[PDB]
Amino acid sequence: LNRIIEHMNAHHVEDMKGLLKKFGQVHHAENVAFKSVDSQGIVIGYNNNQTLRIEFNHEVKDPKDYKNATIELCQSVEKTHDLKGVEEEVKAFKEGFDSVCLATLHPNGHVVCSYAPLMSDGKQYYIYVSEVAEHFAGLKNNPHNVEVMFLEDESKAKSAILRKRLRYKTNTRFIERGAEFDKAFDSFIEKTGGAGGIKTIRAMQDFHLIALDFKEGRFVKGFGQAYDILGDKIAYVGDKGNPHNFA
Amino acid sequence: LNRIIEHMNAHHVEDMKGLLKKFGQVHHAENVAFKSVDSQGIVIGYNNNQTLRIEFNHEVKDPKDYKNATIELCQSVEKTHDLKGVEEEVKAFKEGFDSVCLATLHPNGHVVCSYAPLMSDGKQYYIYVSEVAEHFAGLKNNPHNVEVMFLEDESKAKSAILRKRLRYKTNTRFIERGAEFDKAFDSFIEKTGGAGGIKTIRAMQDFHLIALDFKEGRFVKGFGQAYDILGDKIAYVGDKGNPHNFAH
Ligand code: HEM
Numbered sequence: 001l002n003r004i005i006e007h008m009n010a011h012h013v014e015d016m017k018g019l020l021k022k023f024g025q026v027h028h029a030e031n032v033a034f035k036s037v038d039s040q041g042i043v044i045g046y047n048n049n050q051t052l053r054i055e056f057n058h059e060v061k062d063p064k065d066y067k068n069a070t071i072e073l074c075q076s077v078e079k080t081h082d083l084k085g086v087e088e089e090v091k092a093f094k095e096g097f098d099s100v101c102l103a104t105l106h107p108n109g110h111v112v113c114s115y116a117p118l119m120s121d122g123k124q125y126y127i128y129v130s131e132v133a134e135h136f137a138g139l140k141n142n143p144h145n146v147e148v149m150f151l152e153d154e155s156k157a158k159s160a161i162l163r164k165r166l167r168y169k170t171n172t173r174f175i176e177r178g179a180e181f182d183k184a185f186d187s188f189i190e191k192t193g194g195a196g197g198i199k200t201i202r203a204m205q206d207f208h209l210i211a212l213d214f215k216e217g218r219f220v221k222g223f224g225q226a227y228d229i230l231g232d233k234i235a236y237v238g239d240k241g242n243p244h245n246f247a
Numbered sequence: 248l249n250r251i252i253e254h255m256n257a258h259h260v261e262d263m264k265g266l267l268k269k270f271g272q273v274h275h276a277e278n279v280a281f282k283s284v285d286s287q288g289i290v291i292g293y294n295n296n297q298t299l300r301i302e303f304n305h306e307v308k309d310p311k312d313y314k315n316a317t318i319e320l321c322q323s324v325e326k327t328h329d330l331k332g333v334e335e336e337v338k339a340f341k342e343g344f345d346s347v348c349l350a351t352l353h354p355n356g357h358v359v360c361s362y363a364p365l366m367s368d369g370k371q372y373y374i375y376v377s378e379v380a381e382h383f384a385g386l387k388n389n390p391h392n393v394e395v396m397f398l399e400d401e402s403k404a405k406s407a408i409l410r411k412r413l414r415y416k417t418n419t420r421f422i423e424r425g426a427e428f429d430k431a432f433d434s435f436i437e438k439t440g441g442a443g444g445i446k447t448i449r450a451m452q453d454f455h456l457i458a459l460d461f462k463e464g465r466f467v468k469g470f471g472q473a474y475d476i477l478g479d480k481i482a483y484v485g486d487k488g489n490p491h492n493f494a495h
Pocket residue numbers: 115116128129130131132133134197198200201269270408409465467470471472473484485486487488489490491
């Protein structure tokens with residue numbers, strides 16, 4: 001760690017000040033120097049013989065990668081503000097799924113947490129659902145009280161407490177069978193490969209393609225890296241820094 | 248194909264009738280016989296000139312596996328009824344997750360679809376969430392209007408249209424810091440390995456452990472394999488067969 005300490009103190013002092021402020025609410029730190037790194041995080045020293053420990057978002061399994069993980073953490077402070085990059089991540093994130101989770105309000109007054117197959121044509125997204133499923137009644141009766149969530153697989157996520165997610169308050173509407181329907185479905189068949197029952201449900205008339213018109217969105221890709229979305233506008237949510245601990 | 252047809256006609260005639268009834272709502276079929284199998288499904292012939300095609304829930308890439316895939320589908324008709332086996336699968340399914348999806352009702356009136364880390368002390372399950380998140384207001388103000396979903400990862404599922412899932416109408420209640428909190432949190436650290444920020448959020452006072460009391464549940468593990476659950480009782484939902492296409 002001796003070499004790492006030298007490296008950080010020589011090229012990432014301003015980043016460390018950024019980390020101290022963002023994660024520790026330490027605003028006027030002096031004598032900022034890198035103290036250590038271990039498989040789970042780093043320790044930054046400052047001021048009156050003090051330190052702030054900041055954990056990585058995963059365990060770094062090989063000591064050979066401690067340096068890069070530390071650099072990534074230091075660079076995350078400014079990267080948080082690369083809105084163009086976040087916008088591109090959001091687009092690519094959505095393209096990596098063939099299904100989404102939903103919250104709907106059923107006519108029985110109870111919320112419903114479910115999931116449905118996701119399809120798309122251009123920038124238009126849709127879900128394909130059956131009248132037999134509990135979420136159908138809510139999509140039909142409360143079409144504008146719906147939230148759609150793109151949630152990263154637990155097995156692909158950094159940890160159980162940081163699964164990347166993209167959520168949108170959504171207005172829904174039914175799409176009748178026809179040209180629009182076939183374009184979305186053919187696209188789904190091509191992308192997925194079309195096996196597994198997909199061909200069967202296309203012919204089941206109790207299934208409906210429902211367009212998703214997204215309104216307010218919230219994207220979370222890392223600790224202290226949450227964003228609000230609306231149309232083509234995206235804004236970082238934490239200019240004030242760590243809000244936890246009743247900050 | 249000749250050997251597979253011969254095998255199915257000699258050993259699975261009753262299963263094929265079961266599949267015709269279940270998936271095709273064909274009840275008085277005669278002259279039932281196995282017709283073919285391909286990478287995506289099987290075809291059963293019946294009557295003078297009719298057939299029913301039933302797709303596998305995944306593509307069988309190697310023809311060496313067609314017979315087993317076919318036998319699996321045939322045997323699924325009766326296996327669907329094994330409630331003791333389903334009970335076992337449900338318990339094991341929940342133990343395979345360290346997080347769940349949630350639907351909550353925000354005080355403003357809109358529903359919220361989110362997710363939270365999942366913890367437990369034996370049979371008691373809990374979630375751990377922060378006051379900074381939108382689902383907190385619904386968990387605090389509409390604590391008995393919540394649905395928890397255990398959803399299989401898309402990358403592990405048979406397909407996009409068949410991700411296994413277990414959903415429960417749930418009543419929630421807050422757990423104060425103390426011995427119960429520590430038991431659940433310590434168990435979570437030991438299970439997950441405790442890296443990635445878990446240790447940091449334990450100390451954040453804006454986070455609360457919330458116990459989940461599951462009520463009605465619905466488990467879906469395959470096509471035509473959906474079950475209703477309430478406490479210690481489980482029941483198969485499809486006695487009437489394929490409900491799709493407005494079969495009523
Ligand atoms: C022929 C092949 C079948 C296919 C491809 C198929 C497909 C599907 C799909 C994709 C859904 C999800 C709908 C949604 O979430 O909106 C579904 C739900 C359902 N299916 Fe089927 N199904 C088939 C046969 C059956 C049969 C034979 C039964 C009954 C014995 C059945 C009973 C159900 C029930 C009860 C649900 C609702 C499950 C839930 O709680 O989400 N299905 N089916």
